[PDB]
């Protein structure tokens, strides 16, 4: 029971190896029988070899008999059964072969007895048609010959030692005992020579009998295992295996059609590089198969791509010859891979390759920094140039993430490119180009944001991140050093780049990652205030919405009341908003009157000031300066006149909404009054009238903004306002208007559910520019999402959302996610009414079909097929999933039956029902999901039918037949 002893938890593998050695010394036949029985029961054959049947009759008929006597209960074999107990079985099996053959290498392995039978049986079973026998025999003989390779290595070392001692004696001819030692060494050398010849004989026998047959085998895993292990051997025994005689098989196997075999080929090739260099035949094969290696860089499997990139890195360690510049740019594009390990491997290769200004990839004192503020400048320089040439990305986020861990020491040396950006270093280089300036600033944005937060961006995200102590302490002192460095650098950074809008927008994302109590410890609030005045100059010099958003977000980050500086920053915030209030009042009180003219200058001043006010009012409570009077006067004169720019109205509407929501903030504070409550409700009602007028206004972005503002107003006054333990907010609650609901539905249908260019309510996007179709599609998805969010929270009538549910196939790619989620949520809110509106959606589509085609309805057309497919996916959306499972199905069936006989035919004939093809739609909802309620639904169905309708069975009433 050596199979069971090795399998079922062997305490010491060398112990049973020595037991087999002792039994072999006792009697060769019984130990050979035990080893053969072990191998056969390792093959999955439950037959047991006996003494006479092993001794007398040959191995091929043994193989035939055990094929007949396999005695299976399943097709599985011990190399593929689930895991644990069998995994450690396989490991024990391999270790038993290795230790058993390697331990006998001194005296037992030259008896010329066991290996003949073992080789014959294993070769025959590797030529056997049974996959189990082939796999098990290949593994057994494969570990056998691996052990024989180790024995050959030991014999070669012994030959080297005895040759050295023979030459050492041949130096010294003095001594008769020395001559006797020389003759003993010669006899030992001859014994080792004949032992080596025998080992070579069994080596060649096993090789030409097994490996040549089984690397052409139809099983991928046998070839993969063979190639991986042959690379292991050629890594460890390069004396005889490092030649083309074994590399021809590797070259032939590199073109395998299976990913795992090629993975093992790349592992073998890396084993030729790891960890020793250099060999000429290795570089010859590298230059021979550079094209195949770069082919595997773009393989389907991510693992094969990673191994190919690592082999390329190994070649760069060893050769620097075979790789071409186009291959280099291919890997530079692989830096932008979606899969993070591939990108990180490519970035590590890039760091190894293109960074040799003063680092020779060698020892220090000239490699990291030469004690000056200059050596690392050129590394920064081809970072900038690489970002310039990499036109596959406007941002170096993926590039920096790939180059993060490989260049950790280089990416924290922010002071170096800081002097190479602002203060004109002593290197005598050219002027820092504006495109290069923006590229370097984008690189800094990426590097410091990855310095603060360590999570990779979206697509590279994992969510299974754990922070070690080293990680968190590196994060903290990294935060400290960036804080103290950049509170110094940002003042003259802004002073150099005040007028550059995009550079300011990029630079003001870092202060989200600044520990503000360090200012209290560092006493650098004065530099904070200098940067506040500098960004005040930017704000008063820039009118861009994006930079105002960035500034407002930066202020909100530094408006952290948990830090002492909140008063000091609130000084500057109040000062700047007070300036903007004064400027807004001065400009508005002259713009609202007609006068002369109003010209473009006053329009520009009003628009810029209101942009700034709206932007800084989004993130900050500024209702102490009640400018809703000016904004509402501007909105009402926009209503009355209508001849003035769009953006001013957009800014006024958004600023008024911001004021309203900031007032809404300070009523849930536990102190609600009533006079200001009614005042706020009246202002909200006026804002609702203005928003309805703007929705009726001809301008379509104004229509969308009015729609989303109305969405915000309705969710503010939604039914879930009463959830959070509120009592006095009940007067504030305002119900939707049915005409307003119809206007909203009409707007949504005219401006959302469009997938063609015929409507012309969606901007073109044909040219692959910043004005692509994707922006319009995502904006329409956002508007539909806001509308559905109003729908699902008991605010607006969801019979209007039935018309949204009906568009699930015409807009599957565009809005199928939104329609499916809305249907699921409305099912979770009220499944009965959800099913009623679902069958209403089907009725609406069917009535559109009635309008388009008439009462014949074209029952075999694509429209009916699409409606029936929609019915199928709706029926599988139901079932036993929520409460009132079949009651909703019964209600849907009753509604469908009512609709199928809703209209009666005037001519030809009275009993044929119009809208009969809806029974085909309902037949998908009947199917076989239910069984007991089918009788009740049929009883409801037969109320509208007659016996004359029962008896007729033709093409017109085929929907009725299919439903019944």
């Amino acid at each position: 029971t050596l199979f069971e002893v090795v399998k079922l938890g062997k305490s010491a593998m060398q112990s049973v190896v020595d037991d087999w050695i002792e039994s072999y010394k006792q009697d060769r036949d019984i130990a050979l029988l035990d080893l053969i029985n072990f191998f056969i029961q390792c093959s999955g054959c439950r037959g047991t070899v006996r003494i006479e049947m092993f001794r007398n009759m040959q191995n091929a008929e043994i193989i035939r008999k055990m094929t007949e006597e396999f005695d299976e209960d399943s097709g599985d074999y011990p190399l593929t059964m689930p895991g644990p107990q069998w995994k450690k079985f396989r490991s024990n099996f391999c270790e038993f072969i290795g230790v058993l053959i390697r331990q006998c290498q001194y005296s037992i392995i030259y008896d010329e007895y066991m290996m003949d039978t073992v080789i014959s049986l294993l070769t025959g079973l590797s030529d056997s048609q049974v996959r189990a026998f082939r796999h098990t025999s290949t593994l057994a003989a494969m570990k056998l010959m691996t052990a024989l390779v180790n024995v050959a290595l030991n014999l070669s070392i012994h030959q080297d030692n005895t040759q050295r001692q023979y030459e050492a004696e041949r130096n010294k001819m003095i001594g008769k005992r020395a001559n006797e030692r020389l003759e003993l060494l010669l006899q030992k050398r001859k014994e080792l020579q004949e032992n080596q010849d025998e080992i070579e004989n069994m080596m060649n026998s096993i090789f030409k009998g097994i490996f040549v047959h089984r690397y052409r085998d139809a099983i991928a895993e046998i070839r993969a295992i063979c190639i991986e292990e042959i690379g292991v051997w050629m890594k460890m025994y390069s004396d005889a295996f490092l030649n083309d005689s074994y590399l021809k098989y590797v070259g032939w196997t590199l073109h395998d059609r299976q990913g795992e075999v090629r993975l093992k080929c790349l592992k073998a090739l890396q084993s030729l590089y790891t960890n020793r260099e250099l060999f000429p035949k290795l570089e010859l094969f590298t230059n021979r198969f550079k094209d195949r290696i770069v082919s595997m860089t773009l393989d389907k499997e991510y693992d094969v791509a990673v191994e190919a990139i690592r082999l390329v890195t190994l070649i760069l360690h060893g050769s620097e010859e075979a790789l071409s510049n186009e291959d280099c740019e291919n890997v530079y594009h692989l830096v932008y891979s979606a899969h993070r390990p591939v990108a990180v491997a490519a970035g590590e290769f890039l760091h190894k390759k293109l960074f040799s200004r003063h680092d020779p990839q060698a020892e220090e004192a000239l490699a990291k920094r030469r004690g000056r503020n200059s050596p690392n400048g050129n590394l920064i320089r081809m970072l900038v140039l690489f970002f310039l040439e990499s036109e596959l990305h406007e941002h170096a986020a993926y590039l920096v993430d790939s180059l993060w861990e490989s260049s950790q020491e280089l990416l924290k040396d922010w002071e170096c490119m800081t002097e190479l950006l602002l203060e004109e270093p002593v290197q005598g280089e050219e002027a820092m180009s504006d495109r290069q300036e923006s590229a370097l600033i984008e690189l800094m944005v990426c590097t410091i944001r990855q310095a603060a937060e360590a999570h990779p961006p979206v697509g590279r995200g994992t969510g299974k991140r754990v922070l070690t102590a080293k990680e968190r302490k590196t994060q903290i002192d990294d935060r400290n050093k960036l804080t103290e460095h950049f509170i110094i650098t940002l003042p003259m950074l802004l002073s150099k780049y005040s007028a550059d809008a995009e550079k300011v927008a990029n630079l003001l994302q870092i202060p989200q990652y600044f520990d503000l109590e360090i200012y209290s410890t560092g006493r650098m609030e004065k530099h904070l205030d200098a940067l506040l005045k500098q960004i005040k100059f930017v704000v008063e010099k820039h009118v861009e919405s994006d930079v105002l958003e960035a500034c407002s977000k930066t202020y909100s980050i530094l408006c952290s009341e948990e830090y002492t500086i909140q008063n000091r920053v609130d000084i500057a915030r109040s000062q700047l908003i007070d300036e903007f209030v004064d400027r807004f009042n001065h400009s508005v009180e002259d713009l609202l009157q007609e006068g002369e003219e109003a010209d473009d200058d006053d329009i520009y001043n009003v628009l810029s000031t209101l942009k700034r006010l709206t932007s800084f009012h989004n993130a900050h409570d500024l209702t102490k300066w009640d400018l809703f009077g000016n904004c509402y006067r501007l909105l009402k004169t926009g209503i009355e006149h209508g001849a003035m720019p769009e953006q001013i109205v957009v800014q006024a509407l958004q600023c008024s909404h911001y004021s309203i929501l900031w007032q809404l903030v300070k009523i849930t504070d536990g102190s609600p009054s009533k006079e200001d409550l009614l005042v706020l409700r009246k202002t909200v009602k006026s804002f609702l009238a203005v928003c309805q007028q703007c929705l009726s206004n001809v301008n379509t972005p104004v229509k969308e903004q009015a729609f989303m503002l109305l969405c915000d107003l309705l969710m503010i006054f939604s039914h879930q306002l009463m959830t959070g333990g509120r009592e006095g907010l009940q007067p504030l609650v305002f119900n939707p208007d049915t005409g307003l609901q119809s206007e909203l539905l009409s707007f949504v249908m005219d401006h959302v559910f469009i997938d063609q260019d015929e409507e012309n309510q969606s901007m073109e996007g044909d040219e692959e520019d910043e004005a692509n179709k994707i922006e319009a599609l995502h904006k329409r998805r956002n508007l539909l999402a806001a509308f559905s969010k109003l729908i699902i929270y008991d605010i607006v009538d969801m019979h209007a959302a039935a018309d949204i549910f009906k568009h699930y196939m015409k807009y599957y790619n565009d809005y199928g996610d939104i329609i499916k989620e809305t249907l699921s949520k409305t099912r979770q809110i009220d499944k009965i009414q959800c099913a009623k509106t679902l069958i209403l959606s089907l009725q609406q589509l069917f009535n559109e079909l009635v309008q388009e085609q008439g009462p014949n309805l074209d029952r075999t057309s694509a429209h009916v097929s699409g409606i029936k497919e929609l019915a199928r996916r709706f029926a599988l959306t139901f079932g036993l999933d929520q409460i009132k499972t079949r009651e909703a199905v019964a209600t849907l069936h009753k509604d469908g039956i009512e609709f199928a006989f809703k209209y009666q035919n005037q001519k030809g004939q009275e009993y044929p029902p119009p809208n009969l093809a809806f029974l085909e739609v309902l037949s998908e909802f009947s199917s076989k999901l239910l069984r007991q309620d089918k009788k009740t639904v049929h009883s409801y169905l037969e109320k509208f039918l007659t016996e004359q309708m029962m008896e007729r069975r033709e093409d017109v009433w085929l929907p009725l037949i299919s439903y019944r």
């Binding site: 083309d244 005689s245 021809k248 070259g251 032939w252």
Partner: peptide, 9 residues
Amino acid sequence: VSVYDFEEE
């Protein structure tokens, strides 16, 4: 290069 020319069977 001629040893790597596959002519087996």
